[PDB]
Every structure is written in C-alpha cells, then in structure tokens.
Amino acid sequence: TERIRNVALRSKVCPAETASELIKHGDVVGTSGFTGAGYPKEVPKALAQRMEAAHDRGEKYQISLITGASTGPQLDGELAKANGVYFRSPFNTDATMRNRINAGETEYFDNHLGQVAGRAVQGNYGKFNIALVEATAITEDGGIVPTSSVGNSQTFLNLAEKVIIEVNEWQNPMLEGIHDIWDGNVSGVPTRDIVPIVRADQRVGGPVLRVNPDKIAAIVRTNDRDRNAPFAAPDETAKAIAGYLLDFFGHEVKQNRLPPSLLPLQSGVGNVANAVLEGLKEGPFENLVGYSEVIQDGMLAMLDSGRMRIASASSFSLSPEAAEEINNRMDFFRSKIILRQQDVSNSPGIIRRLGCIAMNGMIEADIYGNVNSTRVMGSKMMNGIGGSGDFARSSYLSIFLSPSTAKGGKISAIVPMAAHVDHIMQDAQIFVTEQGLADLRGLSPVQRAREIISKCAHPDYRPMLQDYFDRALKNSFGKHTPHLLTEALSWHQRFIDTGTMLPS
Amino acid sequence: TERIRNVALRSKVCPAETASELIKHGDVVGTSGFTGAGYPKEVPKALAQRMEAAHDRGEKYQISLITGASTGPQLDGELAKANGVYFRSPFNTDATMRNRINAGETEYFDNHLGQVAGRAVQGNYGKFNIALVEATAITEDGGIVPTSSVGNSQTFLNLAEKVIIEVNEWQNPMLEGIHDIWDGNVSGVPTRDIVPIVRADQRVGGPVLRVNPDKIAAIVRTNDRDRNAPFAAPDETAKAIAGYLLDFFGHEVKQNRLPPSLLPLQSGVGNVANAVLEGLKEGPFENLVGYSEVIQDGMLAMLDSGRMRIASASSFSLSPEAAEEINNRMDFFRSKIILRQQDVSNSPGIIRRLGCIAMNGMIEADIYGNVNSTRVMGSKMMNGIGGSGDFARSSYLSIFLSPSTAKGGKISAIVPMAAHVDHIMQDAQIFVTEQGLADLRGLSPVQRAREIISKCAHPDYRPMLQDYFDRALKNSFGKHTPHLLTEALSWHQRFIDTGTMLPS
Ligand SMILES: CC(C)(COP(=O)(O)OP(=O)(O)OC[C@H]1O[C@@H](n2cnc3c(N)ncnc32)[C@H](O)[C@@H]1OP(=O)(O)O)[C@@H](O)C(=O)NCCC(=O)NCCS
Ligand SMILES: CC(C)(COP(=O)(O)OP(=O)(O)OC[C@H]1O[C@@H](n2cnc3c(N)ncnc32)[C@H](O)[C@@H]1OP(=O)(O)O)[C@@H](O)C(=O)NCCC(=O)NCCS
Ligand SMILES: [Cl-]
Ligand SMILES: [Cl-]
Ligand SMILES: [Cl-]
Ligand SMILES: [Cl-]
C-alpha cells in the first residue's frame, strides 16, 4: 500500500546519497528522534560516509545536530564515527557520540527537553538549514505522518530552509492516528497561546505534521529498524525500591494527600522504572493515568491489564517483545495512547496544572538532597538532563529513585556533596533506595541530611556520611547548610585515585 | 472615615497584646508581607515581648513563621531578637533572623516563591493555626483589602484555623482597587484551573481577600510604617552593567530578536536594578511593560513618564521619597499597577506565556555559568532563592548581573566551581558584570567558560580562572565539563582561611 499518498510529492523521491548532498558543511540540522525511536536512518549513514571521504581529502565537513532526544547507531553512531558533528543538542545515549562528547571532540549542551523547540525558534542554535524527519506516510493532503515519536519535528519543519523526509516502510502504517499535533503557539513568539489541555487524555490537534511542500527538497524511501530497549527484568534492588514507593503511595492515599487513583504519572526507563510499573500493575490503585515522556514496557502492560486508562507521551521505548505485542494489537493500543510534541508533553504549565507525580533516576544525591542526573565525577557526561527538570520542578511530587551504591559497591549514591547539580533541594521532595525512603517535605537542609543519611544511605557508607555531617556541623563556615570544603569532593577524588570511595 | 465598613466585625476589635495571646507555642502562623511591605506589625511586637518573658522564666515559646517573602523589623526582627521562631519559610532579609538561621537556632527552607501557596495547601508546613494579615480596610460585605503587597495572604486565610487582622491606617485608603485576587484554583488540589492571563495588564479576579468572618478571632487597629529601604543610588559598577545590558537589548532589537518595546520585564531591587531602570527610562525603547515580583522607584518613574504602560507585581518596594510620591498620586498610579497573588505573579505557566525577560542578581557563578544566589561559601545563608528560580527557568531570556568581585576585591564573583548551586547552566543564558557581557546561547559548557572568563571575570582573577581551566582540560576525569576536584573549592577555603581569594 503506497505510503506517499500525495501523488505530486512522489516526484521528489531520490536516493539517500543524493539527498545527503543537500547537507553542507556548517549546516544546522534538525531531526526526528526520541528515546531511540523515529530518527532518520539512511541519509545520516550516507552523510557519514561522504564526511569521512571529505576529511581524508582535507575538506572540512561537520554539522550541528539538534534532535528531539536520543537517536541510535545509524544517526548518532555513524556521524560520531565519521567525526562529523561539531555541536549536539539536547540529549544523546549513543556510546560513540558520548565518547566524542567526553573527549571534547563534539560540543554538547543538554537543554531542558521541553524548552528545545522555543530556543530553536528564538535562534539559539542558529538558522536551521535542514529538517530531516522520518515519516510513516504522507497523506493525500501533504501531511507528514510521524513514526514512533513526535519530539521536536513540527518545530524543525517550521524553521528549516529545506526539508528531507525519510518514509520508512519498516514502521507500522497503523501508527497513523496516534499522534496529536497542535497548530497553536506553544514555542513561538510571545505572547504564546494558552494550551487548553486539562486532562491527560485530551487531544487538541491533528494526526499530521504540517509543512509547505515547496520546502520539501527530497523524499527518501527507507527500510530500517528503530533501536529497542533491552528485555531485562528488575532485580532485587529495584524491587525493594518499588516496594518502598508503593507503601508510600498507600500511606499518602490513606492520609488523603493523594486520590485513590493517584495523579498523572511520569516515569522513566530502566530497571527501577520497570519495577515501579510492575508494582503498579498489581497494585491497589485503579484507573491510573500516564502523562510522561515515553511509553515503555511497564505502561504497555498496564494499558493492557486495564489498571491504567490512558498514557500520554512523546515517544516509545519498547523491548522487542513489547514491540511485537503492540504491533500485533495496534488498534487496541492506539485508543489508549496519545503521542504529543515534546514541548507539550514537557510543558511546565501543563505538568503543574495536571498535578503530575514525577519519578526519576539519578547518578547521585548529596546529604542535603541536591541531585546529579548527568555528570560522573562532575565532568563526564552520561546521557543528559533530558526532561527530569521540566518534571521535577513542575510536579505535585518530585521523587528520585536509585540503588544506594554503584559500581559493585565501590561508589556511594549518597555523597557529602554532589560533584555536579541538576536538581536543587527545592526540586526534590522524596528519595528512595533499596535501604528505605526519605520524606523531606517541610524540612530544613540539616533536617534533610538526617533523613537522607539514616533512611537512604548504604550501611557501608552511612557512618562515613554521618561523620562528615557531624564534623561539618561543628566546623562549617555557616551552619545553615554545613560543609567541610576541604573534604566535600574528596570521596569523588578518592574514586578517581583508587577506584573506590571506601578507604583502604 | 471608617476603615471597618462591615458593622458586625467591629465587635472583634481588640488590643495588640490581647490578640497576640491567641498565638500559642508551637503554632504555625502564616502572615502577609513581601519585600518589606504589608506585613503585620503590632501583634508581632506584642508577641515578641511575651515570648521573651516566657523564656526568662524557663518556659518555651516559639512558632513556625510562614510568609509571602521578606518582612521587616517589627516582625522578623522582633521575633528573632526574642528567639521566638523555630522554623521560617520561604524568604527573609532581616539581619537578626539571618543570624538565627545561620547559627542553627531557626530552621529554614527557602521554597520557590511561586510554589509556597501550593506546598502549604499540600500540608508541607503542617496545619496552619493562625493567619495574621495587614489590611487597608474591611468592606461592607467583609472583604479584606490588602495593603502594600498581596503575597500568600489569600492562601493563609483559607488554611488557618483562626484569623487576626491588623487594620493599618498608615496605609493609603486608595490602595483599594489596586489588587487582583483570584478565586480560581491556582495552588489547590489538581487538576488546577487554567489561569487565563494573556496580557500583563489583565485582571482575572477582584479587589478583596475573602475569609469566613466566623474565623476572624481579632481585629487590631494599627498605625505604623512599612520597611521603606533607602534608595540605593547607582554607582559606576552598576552604571557599567546597565550600559552593557542596554547595549545588548539594543542589538537584539536591531536583529529582530526582540520587539522595539522589548518583552515583559522582571527585575529585582538595589544598586544594579536601579541603574537598569534608569537606563530604560533614558533609553530608545517605548511602551515597556513590567511583569515582576515588585514595583520599585524606577518603575514608578516610567509609569509617570509613559515609558512603561503597566506594571504587574505582588508587592511594592519603594524608598521614602517614592512612597510619598505614589501616596499623593495614588489615583494615577492605581490605574497603572496591578498587585497579584504571588502564586500568580510567579506562575511559570504565565511567565513563559508572556515571554518575560528575567534580570537577577547572584552571589557567584562558576566558569560554566552555574549560579549561586543564596549560600556564601556554600553554607551561610544570605536571603533565599526567592522568585529567581521561578523567573530564571520560565523566562524567554534569563540574565544574571553582578559586580565581578565582592568584599572590596577580596572575592571573585566568578569561580572554578560554585560552592552551592541555585540555577543550573540550563537556566542562565546571559551574564553581565562591569567587565562585559557573556552571551551563552547555544554554547557547550567549555564554550560557556571561554565566554564567561574573557567577558565577565575581573582582571585580578582571570589568569587564575584560566589556569584552573587549562589544567582541568588536560586532567579532568571527563572533558565535557572539566574540573580538578582537588582544587575546585579551594578558593572558597582560601577565603575562609585568609580573608581573600587571591594568593600570597
Ligand atoms: C541517572 C541515569 C543515568 C541512571 O540510569 P539508570 O539506568 O536508571 O540507573 P543505573 O543504575 O542502571 O545506572 C546507569 C549507568 O550510570 C552509572 N552510574 C549510576 N550511578 C553512578 C554513580 N553514582 N557513579 C558513577 N556511575 C554511576 C551506572 O554505572 C550505569 O553505567 P554502566 O552502564 O556503565 O554500568 C538516568 O536516569 C538518566 O540518564 N537521567 C537523565 C534523564 C532523565 O532523567 N529523563 C527523565 C525521564 S526518562
Ligand atoms: C544574590 C543577591 C544576594 C545579590 O544582592 P545584590 O543587591 O544584587 O548585590 P550585593 O552585592 O549588594 O549583595 C549583598 C550582599 O551579598 C554579598 N555578596 C555578594 N556577592 C558575594 C560573594 N561572591 N561572596 C560573598 N558575599 C557576597 C555582599 O557582600 C553583600 O553582603 P552584605 O549584605 O553583608 O553587605 C540578591 O540578588 C538575592 O538575594 N537574590 C535571591 C532572590 C532573587 O533573586 N529574587 C528575584 C527578584 S529580587
Ligand atoms: Cl498553557
Ligand atoms: Cl516543602
Ligand atoms: Cl495556566
Ligand atoms: Cl541554549
């Protein structure tokens, strides 16, 4: 069944190699792609090959690459190998690209995900020369049907001088209808429009990205696969964390601080997230609702079981198994899922209005409950802040969850001072590890420290943490947030020097 | 003429001392008061004396004090002198209260100002025993007309078990009508109402605070002045900063990145703020609009001249001469100013929608442009984060302005690593000192550092900053945000140990 239903736009079909030639050295390129879903695949590959060849000849050939969020080996991977990206934003998870970033070979800034569209329109990244977007189909009307994510695609389409569409036959035609694209002013020139969303399941727009066809310079027929999440079940540590949170949710409900169906939930990806979602699947809270960035295995299962009514997101992040399931039952799931532009899914105005519960991971937290989401030892990028700040600050409740240790016990997730800060004390109310849960609402910093140390820290590290805090209370410059500046970052340096935070 | 226009409530008038007897040890007390304006005065003084008396007899007497933001000598001052406050939130500028906080004698948490009402309703502060609110008048139907600020007063009235009103005849009767109080769900239980503000000059509510008269336990007739702080006359450092900033606005206009009337402006108070307001007054930009936390002297000047068309705020913050000016012309200024609940003035949804330009001060920034607004050496509280987070993250443009040094040259305002972080890199785009202006838009951390070091740091400290940076780039665990953890906080320790950050 022909995917390009606009007859005239079929004349714009050309090979991936020829399309890649439209991209010039120095260009700013905006692409689809979010949580490894719906990023362009073939043009980037071709571009990378031509970039390597050019380099060998002595011709500079790099681009600035702005995405929705993370992509995959075909985009981030290949361009990184070719050393073809001089600047990248706002979120990467490709190892090759991560290495370029951490070597200082590619410049990187991890903007709040919900702000990217607005900053792009304001001109922060420069003029967009190209928008390269993956499509499931093109409608008779010239509408562009997105694939497994929406991300920033509508904005990039608006901004770009020229547009390249990759129509990918690998993607399920039945995705058509699942997306909700608003034509209102969310991220454009002030004064912006009021975004009329008052319920997580409320659609406000249409199923297609809009673009002036005069701007489409090439359409490339492709056939390649998105990246998948791993099929891996939560361990005992994740389950313990999930148990503490579920008990908390229960107590809140019983105290009437949460409705029996809780509030719209924002969850992440990974073992902890999956344990929480697995817990909620069999939990006592009915008619749950999701207002998140991503649809993962967990949320799929609850939508399946009926324990969750609807789920809003910008993207998918599914195991091969889960992907097989949804593709077989797309007509069922399409009625349960809304995929939104990321500047809507991640809108602080909407998140606060709906009263979302934010549940996020972290690298580390200090004893006062400042959170590092990004930079190991304060300098080595992991993934990026992503939407954790959009949600943490705007949510009804901001919860951070993590194993109390990393690297086989050689690193403590609770430290005297975070080597880098992404979420300040004000943006984190609840902490959970396999050791217990710390409820920090209404507490001063010294009060926070007492809860975090006593409830959350691993027994191997707790006495060391208490010792730091007790000595700081005694000798710190001020006593409002006591620190010993000579040792605040010493555990981190000790890891660097010896490979462990534990004394020898 | 009579300020209490509802006859029934006149029966609840009583002496300040007697009213203060309603407040018991351990009570949570919510009061009016924001930037030195509109806080209760006589009841707190009476309370303080009774506390001191109890203490002398070995009897405990302390309260939890929750406010709009800063108060004055009659409130924060007296109670702190009496050691009568066990917990304080969210924002203080009184020097005695500051000492209690930094000595560990008063527990303190500086919540984001826009969030305080919401967290209070969620119960983070506990159950409110008392609301203590200053009024201009009481209307025929028992509405409470606020005075020189709105702050959190409507929310404290809703929550408190008992209410005490201070009717202050020092306050101008023609303040009635200047306030806009909404009965919509801004900070209550989700789902919240949409706050329909699409223009800075838009009113959405009415002129009075509402309260069940059955809750009013006392009314005190008073006559006492707000804290009208002396006008901070711009110095050459401030004039230079304003000069760089205004030059910057000028360039943005000519490149069509701002309209000729700029965008809604949020500014603070003091030296630099005053210099900026004077520059706008003399500047080329017409039809300016203020959407801020406070109205200051310089704003009044533009409203008078017609350079500014409207000013939205939660509070006044005026010198004696400005206070007298508006008092003789309250009818004129009443038409040009809207005072709002602080959960509306500081609403991220609205700030972003309007596209405000945020201009804020700081203690320090590190070379990567993370900002500390609160904690000296990381441990000693100054004032509090206030609304800087509300505005910085939500704004169209986030600007931080400061002298490049402090303590007469002995401290650098630009450092290797900030001792405490209030505003992450993502929340700060422009830095201005008397040395120059750093435009960070679209830059990676390393690129930010190169701009901050060259444009903003003081010549006394630039070489030291550059040497830290150079060696970090060579040795740091990762090269994305290079640091040397052995010396990142060493300048702060040097200051603690020697009284200067410069070496010997
Ligand atoms: C913080 C974050 C990296 C943790 O991921 P996670 O999978 O949930 O946690 P994990 O325990 O599995 O650890 C992930 C990696 O970080 C490393 N890590 C975690 N904590 C660490 C620490 N304190 N020190 C050093 N490394 C650490 C782990 O070693 C692991 O790396 P590895 O693959 O080499 O073993 C992740 O949540 C993230 O990138 N956050 C930012 C984006 C975001 O929050 N978006 C919001 C919704 S998705
Ligand atoms: C950060 C802040 C304290 C700066 O104040 P400012 O008026 O701009 O400039 P100042 O230099 O006069 O700061 C005042 C004090 O901070 C001290 N200070 C400033 N920078 C310092 C530094 N790097 N190290 C140590 N002390 C410093 C000054 O010495 C001064 O001390 P003092 O009160 O004993 O005289 C102030 O902006 C603030 O409290 N910010 C938080 C709230 C806010 O931004 N809300 C939004 C609208 S106001
Ligand atoms: Cl909105
Ligand atoms: Cl709180
Ligand atoms: Cl709103
Ligand atoms: Cl940016």
User: Quick one: which atom of ligand 1 is closest to the CA of A361?
Assistant: 37
CB of B64 closer than 8 Å to CB of B87: yes
Tokens of A461: 């590290």
Q: In this structure, is the dihedral angle defined by the CA atoms of residues A178, A179, A184 and A185, taken in order, positive or negative?
A: positive
Residue A308 has φ and ψ, to the nearest 5°, of: -120, 130
How many whole angstroms separate alpha carbon B315 and alpha carbon B341? Answer: 9
The helix/strand/coil state of A203 is coil
Tokens of B200: 């800075």
CB of A361 closer than 8 Å to CB of A391: no
What does B361-421 look like in DSSP terms, one character per residue? --SEEETT--EESSEETTTEE-S--TTHHHHHHHSSEEEEE--SEEGGGTEESEESS-SS-
Neighbours of B372 (CB within 10 A): 23
CB of A391 closer than 8 Å to CB of A266: yes
Report resolution (Å) to 1 decimal: 2.0
From the candidates B293, B364, B434, B451, give the one annotated as an active-site residue.
B293
Closest alpha carbon to B426 in A166, A45, A348, A377: A348
Instruction: Please report which helix (H) or strand (E) contains residue A371, including its range.
Output: strand A371-372
CB neighbour burial string for B469-492, b if at least 16 within 10 angstroms, e if fewer = beebeeebbbbbbbbbbebbbbbb
* Locus of tokens 């809270």: A285
**Elucidated via:** X-ray
How many whole angstroms separate alpha carbon B166 and alpha carbon B148? Answer: 13
Tokens of B199: 């223009």
Residue type, A493: Q
Neighbours of B150 (CB within 10 A): 29
Cβ distance of B190 and A444 shorter than 8 Å: no
Neighbours of B182 (CB within 10 A): 19
- Cβ-Cβ contacts under 8 Å, B348 against chain A: 348-349, 352, 393-394
Cβ distance of B198 and A191 shorter than 8 Å: yes
How many whole angstroms separate alpha carbon A181 and alpha carbon A461? Answer: 49
Question: In terms of DSSP bridges, do strands B371-372 and B364-366 run parallel, antiparallel, or are they unpaired?
Answer: antiparallel
First vs last Cα of chain B: how many Å apart?
Answer: 68
Residue B358 has φ and ψ, to the nearest 5°, of: -95, 125
Total residues found in chain B within this entry? 504
Instruction: Please report which helix (H) or strand (E) contains residue A216, including its range.
Output: strand A216-222
CA–centroid distance for B119 within its chain:
18
Tokens of B161: 């078990």
Say how many CA atoms lie within 13 Å of B39 toward its Cβ.
Answer: 30
Closest alpha carbon to B247 in B457, B405, B430: B430
* CA separation, residue B113 to residues B14, B66, B86, B418 (Å): 33, 11, 20, 23
Contacts of B181 (CB under 8 A, 6+ apart): B146, B150, B154, B205, B206, B207, B208, B209, B210, B341
Cβ distance of A477 and B422 shorter than 8 Å: no
Q: At what angle do helices A320-328 and A297-305 cross, to 10 degrees?
A: 40
CB neighbour burial string for A358-375, b if at least 16 within 10 angstroms, e if fewer = bbbbbbbbbbbbbbbbbb
How many whole angstroms separate alpha carbon B368 and alpha carbon B443? Answer: 10
Nearest CA to ligand 2 atom 44: B388
Neighbours of A62 (CB within 10 A): 19
Residue A486 has φ and ψ, to the nearest 5°, of: -70, -20
| Closest residue in chain A to residue B120, using alpha carbons only | A442
Beta bridge partners of A21: none
The helix/strand/coil state of A135 is strand
Closest alpha carbon to A287 in A268, A257, A245, A259: A259
Closest alpha carbon to A224 in A36, A502, A392, A52: A36
Q: What angle do CA A479, A483, A485 make, to 5 degrees?
A: 135
Closest alpha carbon to B93 in B111, B69, B115: B69
Ligand 1 lining (C-beta closer than 6 Å): A 268-272, 293, 360-364, 373, 376, 382-383, 386-388, 403, 406-407, 411, 413
First vs last Cα of chain A: how many Å apart?
Answer: 67
Neighbours of B214 (CB within 10 A): 7
Contacts of B251 (CB under 8 A, 6+ apart): none
Q: In this structure, is the dihedral angle defined by the CA atoms of residues A117, A120, A121 and A122, taken in order, positive or negative?
A: positive
A376 to chain B, any CB pair closer than 8 A? The answer is yes
How many whole angstroms separate alpha carbon B350 and alpha carbon B387? Answer: 14
CA distance A414 to chain B (A): 17
Closest alpha carbon to A411 in A452, A368, A364: A364
Choice from A363, A376, A412 to test ligand 1 binding pocket (greatest atom count within 8 A of CB): A363
Residue type, B113: L
Beta bridge partners of A165: A133, A219
Question: In terms of DSSP bridges, do strands B216-222 and A411-412 run parallel, antiparallel, or are they unpaired?
Answer: unpaired
Residue type, A315: S
Residue A438 CA, ligand 1 centroid: distance in Å: 20
Tokens of A235: 């361990």
CB of B94 closer than 8 Å to CB of B70: yes
The helix/strand/coil state of A39 is coil
CB of A438 closer than 8 Å to CB of A431: yes
Residue A307 has φ and ψ, to the nearest 5°, of: -65, -20
How many whole angstroms separate alpha carbon A212 and alpha carbon A225? Answer: 28
Beta bridge partners of A415: A366
The helix/strand/coil state of B144 is strand
How many whole angstroms separate alpha carbon A301 and alpha carbon A483? Answer: 46
Interface of A with B in 315-344 (CB under 8 A): none
Closest alpha carbon to A148 in A362, A393, A363, A315: A315
How many whole angstroms separate alpha carbon B202 and alpha carbon A447? Answer: 41
* Locus of tokens 């890891």: A495
Tokens of B347: 């609403």
How many whole angstroms separate alpha carbon A447 and alpha carbon A455? Answer: 12
Q: In 3-state terms, chain B is what percent helix, strand and coil (to 5)?
A: 35, 20, 45
Interface of A with B in 27-86 (CB under 8 A): none
CB of A128 closer than 8 Å to CB of A401: no
Nearest to B480 among A102, A111, A445 (CB): A102
- DSSP 8-state symbol, B60: -
* Locus of tokens 């500028």: B93
CB of B106 closer than 8 Å to CB of B100: yes
Neighbours of B30 (CB within 10 A): 29
Burial class (CB in 10 A: 0-12, 13-18, 19+), B390: buried
Question: In terms of DSSP bridges, do strands B397-401 and B357-360 run parallel, antiparallel, or are they unpaired?
Answer: parallel
Burial class (CB in 10 A: 0-12, 13-18, 19+), A294: buried
Cis peptide before B348 (omega within 30 of 0): no
Residue B95 has φ and ψ, to the nearest 5°, of: -65, -35
Beta bridge partners of B401: B432
Cis peptide before A196 (omega within 30 of 0): no
CA–centroid distance for A487 within its chain:
33
How many whole angstroms separate alpha carbon B479 and alpha carbon A149? Answer: 31
* Locus of tokens 């203080």: B92
Residue type, A48: A
The helix/strand/coil state of B210 is coil
How many whole angstroms separate alpha carbon A231 and alpha carbon A249? Answer: 27
Residue type, B345: S
How many whole angstroms separate alpha carbon A236 and alpha carbon A12? Answer: 54
CB of B364 closer than 8 Å to CB of B336: no
* CA separation, residue A459 to residues A504, B4, B59, B96, B427 (Å): 17, 62, 40, 40, 36
Question: In terms of DSSP bridges, do strands B63-66 and B28-31 run parallel, antiparallel, or are they unpaired?
Answer: parallel
Nearest CA to ligand 2 atom 43: B388
Instruction: Please report which helix (H) or strand (E) contains residue B44, including its range.
Output: helix B42-56
Closest alpha carbon to B389 in B70, B124, B114: B114
CB of B267 closer than 8 Å to CB of B293: no
Tokens of A189: 């020139």
CA distance B409 to chain A (A): 20
CB of B279 closer than 8 Å to CB of B301: no
What does B290-355 look like in DSSP terms, one character per residue? EESSEEEHHHHHHHHHTSEEEEEESEEE--HHHHHHHHHSHHHHHTTEEEE-HHHHT-HHHHHHHT
> What strand order describes the sheet that includes B265-266?
B179-180, B337-340, B308-313, B288-291, B265-266, B357-360, B397-401, B430-433, B436-439
Cβ distance of B477 and A486 shorter than 8 Å: no
B480 to chain A, any CB pair closer than 8 A? The answer is yes
Ligand 2 lining (C-beta closer than 6 Å): B 268-270, 272, 293, 360-364, 373, 376, 382-383, 386-388, 406-407, 411, 413
Cβ distance of A87 and B355 shorter than 8 Å: no
Cis peptide before B498 (omega within 30 of 0): no
CB neighbour burial string for A330-355, b if at least 16 within 10 angstroms, e if fewer = beebbebbbbbbbbbbbbbbbbbbbb
* Locus of tokens 């190892």: A95
Q: Give residues whose Cβ lies within 5 Å of ion ligand 6.
A: A 119, 124; B 441-442
CB of A317 closer than 8 Å to CB of A36: yes
Cβ distance of A124 and B441 shorter than 8 Å: yes
Residue A403 CA, ligand 1 centroid: distance in Å: 10
Report the residue of A476, A481, A495 to disrupt the B interface, i.e. the one with the largest count of B CBs within 10 Å: A481
How many whole angstroms separate alpha carbon A56 and alpha carbon A59? Answer: 7
Total CB pairs under 8 A between chain A and B: 227
CA distance A189 to chain B (A): 8
Contacts of A328 (CB under 8 A, 6+ apart): none
Contacts of B485 (CB under 8 A, 6+ apart): A377, A378, A419, A489, A490, A492, A493, A496, B477
Cβ distance of B485 and A478 shorter than 8 Å: no
Tokens of B322: 């400005």
CA distance B59 to chain A (A): 24
Question: In terms of DSSP bridges, do strands B405-406 and B411-412 run parallel, antiparallel, or are they unpaired?
Answer: antiparallel
Binding site listing of A for CoA: 268-272, 363, 383, 387, 407
The helix/strand/coil state of A101 is helix
Residue A193 CA, ligand 3 centroid: distance in Å: 7
The helix/strand/coil state of B232 is coil
The ligand placed nearest to the CA atom of residue B192 is 5
CB of B335 closer than 8 Å to CB of B293: no
Neighbours of A454 (CB within 10 A): 14
Residue B390 CA, ligand 6 centroid: distance in Å: 18
Residue A36 CA, ligand 6 centroid: distance in Å: 23
What does A163-202 look like in DSSP terms, one character per residue? EEEEEETTS-GGGTT-EEB--S-SSSSSSPPP----STT-
Residue A414 CA, ligand 1 centroid: distance in Å: 14
Provide the residue ranges of all domains of chain A, joining segments of one domain with +: 1-182+205-223+235-504
Tokens of A401: 């969850």
Tokens of B435: 């040395």
Residue B441 CA, ligand 3 centroid: distance in Å: 25
Cβ distance of A420 and B393 shorter than 8 Å: no
Cβ distance of A104 and B479 shorter than 8 Å: yes
From the candidates A42, A293, A364, A434, give the one annotated as an active-site residue.
A293
How many whole angstroms separate alpha carbon A223 and alpha carbon A150? Answer: 19
Cis peptide before A191 (omega within 30 of 0): yes
Closest alpha carbon to A358 in A295, A255, A273, A243: A273
Interface of A with B in 388-407 (CB under 8 A): 389, 393-394, 396
Q: What angle do CA B170, B313, B373 make, to 5 degrees?
A: 105
Cβ distance of B426 and A478 shorter than 8 Å: no
How many whole angstroms separate alpha carbon B23 and alpha carbon B45? Answer: 13
How many whole angstroms separate alpha carbon B109 and alpha carbon B319? Answer: 28
Tokens of B392: 């910085």
The ligand placed nearest to the CA atom of residue A415 is 1
Q: What is the dihedral of CA B352, A205, A265, A261, to 10 degrees?
A: 120
Residue A204 has φ and ψ, to the nearest 5°, of: -120, -5
How many whole angstroms separate alpha carbon B325 and alpha carbon B231? Answer: 14
Q: Where are the beta strands (DSSP E) in A109-161?
A: 130-138, 144-146
- DSSP 8-state symbol, B109: -
- Cβ-Cβ contacts under 8 Å, A262 against chain B: none
Whether A293 sits among the annotated catalytic residues: the reply is yes
CB of A89 closer than 8 Å to CB of A112: no
Say how many CA atoms lie within 13 Å of A424 toward its Cβ.
Answer: 29
How many whole angstroms separate alpha carbon B156 and alpha carbon B164? Answer: 11
The helix/strand/coil state of A499 is coil
Neighbours of A285 (CB within 10 A): 18
- Cβ-Cβ contacts under 8 Å, A256 against chain B: none
How many whole angstroms separate alpha carbon B481 and alpha carbon B367? Answer: 10
Tokens of B45: 């003084």
Closest alpha carbon to A274 in A237, A325, A313: A237
Contacts of B34 (CB under 8 A, 6+ apart): B67, B68, B69, B70, B149, B150, B151, B293, B294, B314, B315, B342
